[PDB]
Amino acid sequence: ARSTNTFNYATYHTLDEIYDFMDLLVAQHPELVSKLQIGRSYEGRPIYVLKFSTGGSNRPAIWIDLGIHSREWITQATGVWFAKKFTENYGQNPSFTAILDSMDIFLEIVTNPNGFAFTHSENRLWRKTRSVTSSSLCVGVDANRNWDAGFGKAGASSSPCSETYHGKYANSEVEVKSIVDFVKNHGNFKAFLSIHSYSQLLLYPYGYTTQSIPDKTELNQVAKSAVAALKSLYGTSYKYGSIITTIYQASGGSIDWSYNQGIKYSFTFELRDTGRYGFLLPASQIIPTAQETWLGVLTIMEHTVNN
Ligand SMILES: CC(C)[C@H](NC(=O)[C@H](Cc1ccccc1)NC(=O)OCc1ccccc1)P(=O)(O)O[C@@H](Cc1ccccc1)C(=O)O
Numbered sequence: 001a002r003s004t005n006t007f008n009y010a011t012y013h014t015l016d017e018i019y020d021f022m023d024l025l026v027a028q029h030p031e032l033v034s035k036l037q038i039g040r041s042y043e044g045r046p047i048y049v050l051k052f053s054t055g056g057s058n059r060p061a062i063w064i065d066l067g068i069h070s071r072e073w074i075t076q077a078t079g080v081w082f083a084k085k086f087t088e089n090y091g092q093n094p095s096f097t098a099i100l101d102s103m104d105i106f107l108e109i110v111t112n113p114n115g116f117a118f119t120h121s122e123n124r125l126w127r128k129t130r131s132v133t134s135s136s137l138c139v140g141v142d143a144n145r146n147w148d149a150g151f152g153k154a155g156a157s158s159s160p161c162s163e164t165y166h167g168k169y170a171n172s173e174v175e176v177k178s179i180v181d182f183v184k185n186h187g188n189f190k191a192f193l194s195i196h197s198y199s200q201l202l203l204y205p206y207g208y209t210t211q212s213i214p215d216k217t218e219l220n221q222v223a224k225s226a227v228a229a230l231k232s233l234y235g236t237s238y239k240y241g242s243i244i245t246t247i248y249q250a251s252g253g254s255i256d257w258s259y260n261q262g263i264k265y266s267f268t269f270e271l272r273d274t275g276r277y278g279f280l281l282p283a284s285q286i287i288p289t290a291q292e293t294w295l296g297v298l299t300i301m302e303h304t305v306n307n
């Protein structure tokens, strides 16, 4: 913590700790990474995105966000390891070097900071944002039911008290609108990855309809390859397939929106485990989870570079 080299990647961190880490990675790798503020949360916290870039102007780009659901702590812990990994492998890893020599990567480690801080202070199992519905005593909106793709349809709830409550209208949550404005404005995103836990699944569109996506054949083959690369390290098994078919029906999910904006490689990872620890995954599993997930993410980015 006097350098990202001495930061402890094998434990779970607080919001102050992860925000300070982003400042330190940018100070140590000024030619590769920068910190962008893309918005403010409902209670006033900055929403930051790390940009990894070799140069250029508006290059094709890859989006990755983690922590949209705050109790899924392995996802923010995996994102901190990804960020260091990126600065360790550029130059060393030949395909990763080749991706970053043609494209940029945007990494949002804490997509829901109010929920995150709330999981450290009052409820470890908090999922939603902290929007206050003054109609109810129930707080927050499920930010992964707030996107404008099948919004309001089966797979989300109209009660503010539901864990799956969609909000009063699409993009009502500022932490969803912040991504939406930034991605649309950028205009050159090629892949959109949103990481969750748990279940060990690789998911692609759609969640709000049983109809197949036009590109189902291609995405199924990328998912198949990505899941094989991941299992190569420690034998971890993943299942993959469309959201509605593989976990359950869900409307207003971010991957369905991005795919409908024309971003073809739209995938959600559900990380470890399959329920034995669930959201409370032991810290001794952070680095093995991050390492095998990298192999899965790298496979998809390779495919995106190549076509
Ligand atoms: C446990 C894991 C499946 C996470 N889900 C959750 O945390 C859910 C939320 C919920 C509550 C009530 C009713 C329905 C759903 N709650 C929950 O308790 O999960 C139980 C469960 C696990 C496995 C299978 C089936 C059910 P996750 O948030 O990662 O799942 C994604 C799936 C998804 C990804 C991408 C797009 C849409 C949906 C999501 O629900 O937003």
Ligand SMILES: [Zn+2]
Residues within 6 Å of the ligand: 068, 069, 072, 144, 196, 197
């Ligand atoms: Zn989730």
